[PDB]
Paper text:
Using biochemical, biophysical and structural biology methods, we show that a single aspartate to asparagine polymorphism expands the binding spectrum of APikL2 to host proteins of the heavy-metal associated (HMA) domain family. The structures were solved and refined as described in the Materials and Methods. In each case, the APikL2 variants and HMAs form 1:1 complexes, with both displaying the same global fold and interaction interfaces as previously described for the interaction of AVR-Pik with the Pik-1 integrated HMA domains.
X-ray diffraction data were collected at the Diamond Light Source (Oxford, UK) to 2.3 Å and 1.8 Å resolution, for APikL2F/sHMA94 and APikL2A/sHMA25, respectively. The largest differences between the complexes are within interface 3, where APikL2 forms several interactions with sHMA25 that cannot be formed with sHMA94 due to differences in the sequences of the HMAs in this region. The interface 2 region of sHMA94 and sHMA25, which forms contacts with the Asp-66/Asn-66 residues of APikL2, is highly conserved in both complexes. However, we observed that the presence of Asn-66 in APikL2F results in an altered local hydrogen bonding network around Gln-44 in sHMA94, when compared to Asp-66 in the APikL2A/sHMA25 complex. In this orientation, the NE2 atom of Gln-44 interacts with the OG1 atom and backbone carbonyl of Thr-38.
Residue numbers in the entry:
A (entry chain A): 1 to 78
B (entry chain B): 23 to 113
The structure:
C-alpha cells in the first residue's frame, strides 16, 4: 500500500548530531528506513506509512532547535 | 530548451558531483538526480523517481515538481531558482 519519502531539514553540522537525528527518526512508528541527504548533510529522509511526522518534526525540533519538512515524494511501486 | 540556457552559465549536469542520498531498503531506487540553483549557484541536490512528481520547499515556497520519463523537471518555481534533472548514471 502507499508509502511516503519525507525529507526533514534540521541544524545538523557534524556526524554526532546527524547520528542523534537518525536514531530518533529510526525509533518513530512507521519509519521503515532513514538516510542523510542534502549537499550540506542537513537533511534526513524517512520512508514509511503511518509515520506521525508532526510528532517526529517536534522531537527533532526540540533536540536540534530547527527542523521542518522540505520534501515529500510518494513511493512509486515496482 | 533550458539545459541549453544552463550551459550558457556553465552548468553541466553530466559533470556535477552526485547528490548525497541513500537507496532505502524495500523500495525501488530513485532513477533521477535533481540539482537546485539560486542565481545559477548550486544550493542543493537529491534524487527523485522518473515519470512521477514530488513536492519541495524552495525558499518560502512549496512547489510541485513533475519529473517526466527522461528526468526532465517542470513546475512553477520561485524567481531566481532553477531545478534541473538527469537520469542517474546507469539508469
Amino acid at each position: 500500500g502507499p508509502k511516503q519519502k519525507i525529507v526533514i531539514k534540521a541544524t545538523m553540522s557534524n556526524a554526532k548530531s546527524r547520528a542523534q537525528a537518525m536514531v530518533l527518526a529510526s525509533k518513530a512508528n512507521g519509519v521503515g528506513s532513514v538516510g542523510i541527504t542534502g549537499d550540506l548533510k542537513d537533511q534526513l529522509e524517512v520512508v514509511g506509512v503511518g509515520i506521525d511526522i508532526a510528532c517526529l518534526v517536534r522531537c527533532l525540533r526540540k533536540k536540534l532547535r530547527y527542523a521542518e519538512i522540505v520534501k515529500v515524494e510518494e513511493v512509486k511501486d515496482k | 530548451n533550458e539545459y541549453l540556457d544552463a550551459k550558457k552559465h556553465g552548468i553541466d549536469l553530466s559533470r556535477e558531483r552526485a547528490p548525497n542520498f541513500v537507496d532505502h531498503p524495500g523500495i525501488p531506487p530513485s532513477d533521477c538526480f535533481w540539482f537546485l540553483y539560486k542565481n545559477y549557484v548550486r544550493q542543493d541536490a537529491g534524487v527523485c523517481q522518473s515519470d512521477w512528481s514530488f513536492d519541495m520547499k524552495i525558499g518560502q515556497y512549496w512547489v510541485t515538481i513533475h519529473t517526466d520519463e527522461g528526468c526532465r523537471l517542470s513546475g512553477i518555481i520561485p524567481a531566481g531558482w532553477l531545478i534541473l534533472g538527469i537520469k542517474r548514471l546507469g539508469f
